[PDB]
Design a protein around this ligand. Structure first.
Ligand SMILES: NC(=O)c1ccc[n+]([C@@H]2O[C@H](COP(=O)([O-])OP(=O)(O)OC[C@H]3O[C@@H](n4cnc5c(N)ncnc54)[C@H](O)[C@@H]3O)[C@@H](O)[C@H]2O)c1
Length: 245
């Protein structure tokens, strides 16, 4: 998959799946800009922009400055997200509000500031990282899953709005992936693969959890010309755990 001479923006690029994705686009030849609240690495193989995607004002300013200098935004990837766990009636009011401000509002803010660019240029691809928790209820993750189901719906309607401009808009829904967000919760991995029948959580038929590169490669496929007739789709990347749900 050859992205030479394409401008690619990736949110959540300071680490994890967002980092892996931005690096994969660099490895594919793209001119990559990463966006994140914090870049704690000593060096990044791409341009980096400090941005709190939940802050509508900050997103308008950064997008306006950058969009001045580029003719074309070839790929937007929304991968910024936070995970706040809890029984629904124990989750704090801050955890609720921040979950939705970031996981839905972030993409909303980026969409509000980039859709005109996508309409003007007449093409491009958007890939949004949802989650398997948007596909199946998960004990402890009611808010997280709800925010990711709202993100998915928003991205699909934005895809429908932009389809007349030739823009393709798709999603990837990872299952458990080896990143910082997952390590916070070391037999945990084998037990995830096995499942928790007591929590109605299916094991992983493929017998392993995901690598961030395995999510990245799916994003690149959907962003690429190989997927030139794919839009409004959501690929679950989870070793079969949701059984196709
Ligand atoms: N790891 C998994 O198992 C898993 C499963 C399903 C979905 N996801 C999703 O994948 C995406 C990336 O997750 P990860 O596992 O790499 O998490 P991570 O914590 O390793 O990295 C996520 C990045 O997003 C950034 N971010 C958070 N809030 C932000 C904000 N307001 N503005 C800008 N950047 C912000 C963080 O600073 C961080 O750099 C998220 O949407 C997450 O929900 C991960």
């Amino acid at each position: 998959l050859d992205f030479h001479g394409q401008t690619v923006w990736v949110t959540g690029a300071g680490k994890g799946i967002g980092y892996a994705t931005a690096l994969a686009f660099v490895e594919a030849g793209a001119n990559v800009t990463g966006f994140d609240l914090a870049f704690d690495g000593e060096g990044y193989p791409f341009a980096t922009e400090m941005l709190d995607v939940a802050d509508a004002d900050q997103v308008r300013d950064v997008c306006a400055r950058l969009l001045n200098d580029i003719e074309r935004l070839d790929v937007l990837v929304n991968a910024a997200g936070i995970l706040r766990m809890g029984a629904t009636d124990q989750l704090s009011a801050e955890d609720w509000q921040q979950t939705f401000a970031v996981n839905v509002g972030g993409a909303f803010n980026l969409f509000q500031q980039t859709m005109a660019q996508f309409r003007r240029q007449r093409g491009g691809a958007i890939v949004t990282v949802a989650s398997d928790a948007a596909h199946t209820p998960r004990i402890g993750m009611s808010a997280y899953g709800a925010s990711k189901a709202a993100l998915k719906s928003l991205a699909l309607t934005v895809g429908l709005e932009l389809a007349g401009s030739g823009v393709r808009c798709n999603l990837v829904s990872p299952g458990s992936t080896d990143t910082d967000m997952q390590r916070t919760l070391e037999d945990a991995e084998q037990q995830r693969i096995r499942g928790f029948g007591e929590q109605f959580k299916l094991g992983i038929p493929l017998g392993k959890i995901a690598r961030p590169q395995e999510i990245a490669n799916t994003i690149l496929f959907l962003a690429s010309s190989h997927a030139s007739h794919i839009t409004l789709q959501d690929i679950v990347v989870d070793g079969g755990s949701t059984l196709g749900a």
